[PDB]
Amino acid sequence: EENLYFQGSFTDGQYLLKPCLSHRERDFYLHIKDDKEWTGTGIIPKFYGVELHEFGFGELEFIRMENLMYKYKRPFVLDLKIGTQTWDPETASSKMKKRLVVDSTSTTTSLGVRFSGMERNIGEEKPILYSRYLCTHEVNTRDSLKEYIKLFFNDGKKYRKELVPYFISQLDKMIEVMKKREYKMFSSSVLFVYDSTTTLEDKKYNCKMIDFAHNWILSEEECTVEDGFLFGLNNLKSILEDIENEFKSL
């Protein structure tokens, strides 16, 4: 939704404090907190609990989450929004027209995945930031999405082709859980991160599903519209396989 994932979030060492804009994300993490298919598989961030915090206007609700980039020296971050639509039954009618436009002009409709922002830290320079708004003109084809994902794997010196198998393995795990069709997830993302200083002795990379502000728990609530999530994951995997093959010449 309009709500950027890290907007209003706090960093406390190895944790993030993520503000609760609604109860959906909170309720999702509480719902799966004892389910092994979610918590033992390394596909979502670790969840530590709900907490209230006062910020000068009254107490706000936050969830305490794993900081996936804890101690990263040179972070690389890519957010890909997953699904064939980024609106759901609760989306305001006033905001419907724009979602319908962006979903069709981006790769959301065609692939169930779209570029949602990137950061590259490319030596000792200021980070290079790549806006989500690139998705509707610069990253609006499968080929351009593949090129931008390859740029994510470009650490400024070389393509980090040795990391790609990890990302494919993670997507495979996400596909296996999401095949069960127990949730619908709209406007959620797969977050790709690594520290370019990562080595075999100190592994620093991660791929997680995140941003569950529009998750529907189908055992507790009805949601008839389709999310296209599994379709998005399959297409993303296909792109990563293509990248792996393209990196073979390196």
Partner: protein, 374 residues
């Protein structure tokens, strides 16, 4: 639904509210207007709730930082002191009650941290932070410590962090620039590093809090503490022979405590604004008005020059004003809550050793700019 033709005043229960009521009785004698002083629990929370309806007190007393949020929501009337009246109060206290360019409260009292020391244990307290490690070594050998103060709350640790150049939000053009935060510059790193080394070198304990530090000082266990005028009456009961003085310097530069200004704001919904102005300017903010309050519970230092000059014959009061003038007015802007969270988190994480100073202050920089509009 505020009743016209009377004044209801809200002030915290630890203030001299019986003294303020005596000023209210003097007002009633002259004007025939009844003044009611009340001290309800958590009034600082109640006021924004109750004032939003359009009911509650005519006048509210609280630290100036909180009044910025009140003025943001339009709960405070613009005050109209003429030039003559403004000249009766210290200029810096007016800077504390300005919000969006307009004056929104009358300054009453000024508070700031000072160095409090045990004269028996240390008749010549140190002028610099740098000499405290050697001093602690000497005192430990005699069975005491040099310094204990609350390390859990950034209000207490910030004066050292800011000394060599740390700051919260850049102030210029009468305005705070919230995109320019000074928690992660060379100065802040230097200050926090010195603080952490004090802990590493066993001159302070990371877990020392308000209660532990106060008890220790008041029992003669430690030579120094850092605290404000609110703490003096407990030390008075303890029979420790103590002084209050300028905070130590760091790298030859003064420690910079945040200055709090107890202020009296006027409810924007009050139909008694003229009555409130007459009360505050011509009854309360006079030598006789502040004395009445001070007699009940001491105000520490005050914004009114004429009465401050009398109070400052007490060197503890002179010290409070000295440290206040070397410090900075506490910013009144909503973003301060993010800053406070940031510094609190950074100090705890660095002092505990789970983060280095650089790591902790990098996160503080980020946290200070977090978009807290929920």
């Amino acid at each position: 639904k505020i009743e016209e033709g009377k004044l209801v005043i809200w002030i915290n229960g630890d203030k001299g509210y019986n003294g303020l009521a005596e000023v209210g009785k003097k007002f009633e004698k002259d004007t025939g207007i009844k003044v009611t002083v009340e001290h309800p629990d958590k009034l600082e929370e109640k006021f924004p709730q109750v004032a939003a309806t359009g009911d509650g007190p005519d006048i509210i007393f609280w630290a100036h930082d909180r009044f910025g949020g009140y003025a943001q929501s339009g709960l405070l009337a613009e005050i109209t002191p003429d030039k003559a009246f403004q000249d009766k109060l210290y200029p810096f206290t007016w800077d504390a009650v300005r919000y969006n360019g307009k004056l929104i409260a009358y300054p009453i009292a000024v508070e700031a941290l000072s160095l409090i020391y045990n004269k028996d244990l240390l008749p010549n307290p140190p002028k610099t932070w740098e000499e405290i490690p050697a001093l602690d070594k000497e005192l430990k050998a005699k069975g005491k410590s040099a310094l204990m103060f609350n390390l859990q709350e950034p209000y207490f640790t910030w004066p050292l962090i800011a000394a060599d150049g740390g700051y919260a939000f850049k102030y210029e053009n009468g305005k705070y620039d919230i995109k320019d935060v000074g928690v992660d510059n060379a100065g802040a790193k230097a200050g926090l590093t010195f603080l952490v080394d004090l802990i590493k070198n066993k001159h302070m304990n990371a877990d020392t809090d308000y209660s532990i530090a106060e008890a220790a000082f008041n029992k003669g266990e430690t030579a120094m503490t850092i605290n404000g005028p609110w703490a003096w009456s407990n030390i008075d009961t303890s029979k420790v022979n103590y002084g209050v003085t300028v905070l130590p310097t760091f790298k030859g530069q003064p420690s910079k405590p945040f200055v709090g200004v107890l202020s009296a704001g006027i409810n924007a919904a009050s139909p008694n604004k003229e009555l409130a102005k007459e009360f505050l300017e011509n009854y309360l903010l006079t030598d006789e008005g502040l004395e009445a309050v001070n007699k009940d519970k001491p105000l520490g230092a005050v914004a009114l020059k004429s009465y401050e000059e009398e109070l400052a014959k007490d060197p503890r009061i002179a010290a409070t004003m000295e440290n206040a003038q070397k410090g900075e007015i506490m910013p009144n802007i909503p973003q301060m809550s993010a800053f406070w969270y940031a510094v609190r988190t950074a100090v705890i994480n660095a002092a505990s050793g789970r983060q280095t100073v650089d790591e902790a202050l990098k996160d503080a920089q980020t946290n200070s700019g977090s978009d807290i509009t929920s």
